[PDB]
């Protein structure tokens, strides 16, 4: 029986926080029938993706250090991979939804943006599908094949596709936020012109929503690209930990910070 | 019954001064902000001045800014308007008005022709 | 029971399904269209703008539906109603904008001062704190003639006109007199100091200088409504 | 100043008509209100909590 | 001269009336009712939440059978609801999207609506074709309609912004009678249990009691400080409660001809939109602007309970004929049932 030691244990606690932090976010959106807007649908998609990631983490530790079955182990590794890909896609989808909403402001409220959110969600969760299923179907590292990954047995040949896709998603991420920042700059200029005296809040919010993502995911992708099989496990754990911290960071920015969700939380937490 | 009685009107020579007094009964005077309006002979109603609940917010119209002084006394529930350097254009019927709702920054329909929360008003005539 | 109760329940459920299906399309249409309320004095020129909008495309309210670049718009004119408007003005809290037209050349005694709190009371009203107001200063041509003649002076009806200077960000039209340029921008700041006093970033004002015969008034509303529901979306994202 | 005088006469006549009415003592009216409230205390669903069977909403 | 002496005569009539009322106030209601047991603590809970409205809801009126209701919203929609099963029974669109009042006929054969269009539209619910179409339109008013209630199938009383009320004839189409005398906008009206007299509360901080046949004001009640927004009789019809924007409710007795008790608290600084009595009249339910509703003791002036299940301002509050439950509709397009 394998002996759990040190960092793996302090993984669970972090994942444990997910098991709460996202859960309420998933509950409130489900609980209140007044939050069925497409933005709330995408926020719920992100929340359920990170919740699945956290549950996969805790169950993966349980399987490794309380059962030890290999089949369940790589199944849960695939679950973790698909959940992380779903989180990446949900962030991309919510940012493109924001850009499209701002650009087509008058036209946005229509059925064309209700038949578009569904398509984006389907594409995002189909990217989560398959990519999280790719190792198990025919591209596992159980046999010889070629040089393996940096996260056993996730088949580095799969890691290259994930890294390139993440980089391209980050590029589109940056372009969309550049356009929305241009819009915000125009609005801030008009606002400053209205007042006699002549932006900070939007810059701070954009800095958070970009820097948290980058500093939490880029180390892992860089390690996957540059690392090899024989790398020490300390690097693996130190790179994977911010991926878990993403599940803390994301719900606070989107769900818990919205005014309506805050009003609902005032009643829920106080049991009023 | 809510009743607002105005006093102090009359005939004043040009350049004179007067003191219009408004006594209001039937409501908590300390919870409402008050207004002074006027009606020119043959013309419509025109707002003159307004004072807030505690006297912090005081605003004047263009024609009487710097020449009128509005004040309120919550002890006796009285509203005072001191008019200095009167001119013939100021000859009008002046009325003491109260905002429809308490603890409200907005004040609608104080210049309406058929407003209920105004006194019968007093005539102020500037003539030689 | 199921002898007759089940049939009644099934029929009622089918009915409710039909009404829900109809309300889906009704809601799609309602969210597709944007609702504008037009307000002003009796001589504010709102009738001229209404006629100009209608030619391109007693009842107590007049409904005008026009489309600019495949976007629906509803424009409501209030008529046959008394001047006491503290009760029915609460019905327009959900409109995207209140097109406020003020006769600039009408400065009884003073329409412009009376028009100021008609904007001020709306701005500070408890139930209208989330509604943006578009200010249209009509009769730009009539304002210029009076200023050039010099018969009427703003300083008579506004004591603060003496020390006000032309804004450095102003973009006067070519051939416009410097005197009328300063005066017509002073009226904007009278509506603007009230505009930015309260609200705490929930609704803003969009002043525009328009003529009664300008054909581009649809474009001004097109760009303003493009921005009213664009700042509201940016407040939910805390990018503003 | 003619229609205003007509409105004044109408108001004066209305108050004159309302002048001569008979008022019962406030004690009697309060006693009647208390008696009606006490005589219907058992028939008020909101005042006295109703059983679950009585409530159709539950 | 003539106007001044008319004013003086009116003033001394008012002085005589006030003296007569003061000669009648022998003892207050609080002293009489200090010797009865308090109602304790009531905890009303929400049972049904009704959903399907697009825009803000203003008015609702319960039916005679206390089973159906009607709700009016600025999406141009009158939705006729069944409260027991939370199922929509009817949905009527309007020519004019702006509606401010609604009513439900005692016989259940008609509904009414009105608003900024100056037109009272009476919709017939028992059409042979099966589809509900506009049956009657009344357009004699020169002000926005704020409240309308049915007397029977063929008569209706409407309060509008022209400072006048009107009793119509649906079959005839013309105004049978007009009620004049209010100086402000008549905001709400309530009918007597014997439908013989009715009160109109206006923006002149006053209510007036009118007789349907005579068409003249019988008694005028003052004492309020702000605009009266809602009014409702006691079940016995000898008293009524008035709510205004000054955050105070007041109970006036018709036979005594002045106020009996005022319900107010220092923690409330927001207006009152809707007031209604219970079946026995012991409890007074008042809806406020602070997203909250309060149930007061009608004989103790003590806040019996609080109902805080809404997110926006409460616009309509009604107690059924049987008094089984209380329906509250607010601007967030949600209807709720409390019991």
Order of helices and strands of chain E: HHEEEEEEEEEEEEEEEEEEEEEEEEEEEE
Biggest interface between chains:
D-E, 40 and 62 residues
| Name of the CATH class of chain C | Alpha Beta
Q: Structural class of chain E, please?
A: mainly beta
CATH topology of chain C: Rossmann fold
Tell how many strands the DSSP assignment of chain E holds: 28
How many H/I helical runs of chain C? 7
Strand content of chain C: 15-25%
Shape of chain E: globular
The proportion of residues in beta strands of chain E is over 45%
Strand order of the largest sheet of chain E: 1-28-27-26
CATH level-two architecture of chain E: 7 Propeller
| Name of the CATH homologous superfamily of chain C | P-loop containing nucleotide triphosphate hydrolases
- What is the highest CATH level, the class of chain E? Mainly Beta
What's the multimeric state? heteropentamer
Helix content of chain C: 40-55%
Distance between the termini of chain E: 61 Å
What is the 3D shape of chain C?
A: elongated
Topology (elements, then pairings):
The complex is a heteropentamer of chains A (272), B (128), C (240), D (58) and E (339).
Chain A: H1 7-31, H2 38-67, H3 70-103, H4 105-108, H5 117-131, H6 134-137, H7 156-194, H8 200-226, H9 233-254, H10 259-270
Helix pairs in contact in A: 1-2, 1-9, 2-3, 2-9, 3-5, 3-7, 7-8, 8-9
Chain B: E1 3-7, E2 10-12, E3 17-25, E4 34-39, E5 45-51, E6 58-60, E7 68-73, E8 78-84, E9 92-98, E10 122-126
Parallel strand pairs in B: 2-10
Antiparallel strand pairs in B: 1-3, 3-8, 4-5, 4-9, 5-6, 7-8, 9-10
Chain D: H1 3-19, H2 26-39
What does this structure look like?
- The complex is a heteropentamer of chains A (272), B (128), C (240), D (58) and E (339).
- Chain A has 272 residues and is an all-alpha fold.
- Chain A has a single domain, classed as Rhopdopsin 7-helix transmembrane proteins, CATH 1.20.1070.
- Chain A is built from 10 helices and no strands.
- Chain A is globular and about 70 Å long.
- Chain B is mainly beta and 128 residues long.
- Chain B has a single domain (3-126), classed as Immunoglobulin-like (Sandwich), CATH 2.60.40.10.
- In chain B, strands 2-10-9-4-5-6 form a 6-stranded mixed β-sheet, with no helix packed on it. In chain B, strands 1-3-8-7 form a 4-stranded antiparallel β-sheet, with no helix packed on it.
- In chain B, a hairpin with a 6-residue loop joins strand 5 (45-51) and strand 6 (58-60).
- Chain C is 44% helix and 15% strand.
- In chain C, strands 2-3-1-4-5-6 form a 6-stranded mixed β-sheet, with helices on both faces.
- Chain E has 339 residues and is mainly β.
- In chain E, the strands form 7 sheets. Chain E has a 4-stranded antiparallel β-sheet with strand order 1-28-27-26, with no helix packed on it. In chain E, strands 2-3-4-5 form a 4-stranded antiparallel β-sheet, with no helix packed on it.
- The radius of gyration of chain E is 20 Å and the shape is globular.
- Chains in contact: A-C, A-E, B-C, B-E, C-E, D-E.
- At the D-E interface, helix 1 and helix 2 of D face helix 1, helix 2 and strand 17 of E.
- Chain D: Belongs to the G protein gamma family.
- Chain D: One of its GO terms (biological process) is fibroblast proliferation.
- Chain D: It is a lipid-anchor.
